[PDB]
């Protein structure tokens, strides 16, 4: 004499992305010409 | 994951050092006397 029905459908979804980037550049141009010296009194040299 | 490392080094000893980044012009300048330098030492004597 009677019929009954029930349904229950549940769903879940999840996504997660993490991105990290890093860059570094270092340039050095070294163009020497020479060295200059001064004489300290402790050296004992006549040019002081 | 990803990594990249790049390292470039130029060295000049003699010739026109202002043409270090231009190989052709340095090669052109190698015949100029004013830029000739000591490029190796094959005999060394103790000062004593």
User: In units of Å, what resolution does this entry have?
Assistant: 2.5
CB B29 within 8 A of CB B35: yes
**Token pair for B42:** 């094959």
> Which of B7, B4, B32, B1 lies closest to B18, judged by CA?
B32
Q: Which parts of chain A fold into alpha helices (H)? A: none
CB B12 within 8 A of CB B38: no
Method used to solve the structure: cryo-EM
In chain B, how many H helices and how many E strands? Answer: 1, 0
CB B29 within 8 A of CB B17: no
């Amino acid at each position: 004499f009677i019929t009954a029905n029930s349904e229950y459908s549940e769903s879940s979804s999840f996504k997660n992305t993490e991105t990290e980037k890093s860059m570094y550049t270092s340039s050095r141009y070294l163009f020497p010409q020479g060295r200059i010296d001064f004489t300290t009194p402790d050296s004992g040299f006549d040019d002081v | 994951s990803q990594n990249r490392k790049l390292n470039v080094k130029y060295i000049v000893n003699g010739g026109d050092y202002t043409k270090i980044q231009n190989t052709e012009e340095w090669v052109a300048s190698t015949n100029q006397s004013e830029h000739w330098r000591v490029i190796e030492v094959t005999e060394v004597t103790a000062v004593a």
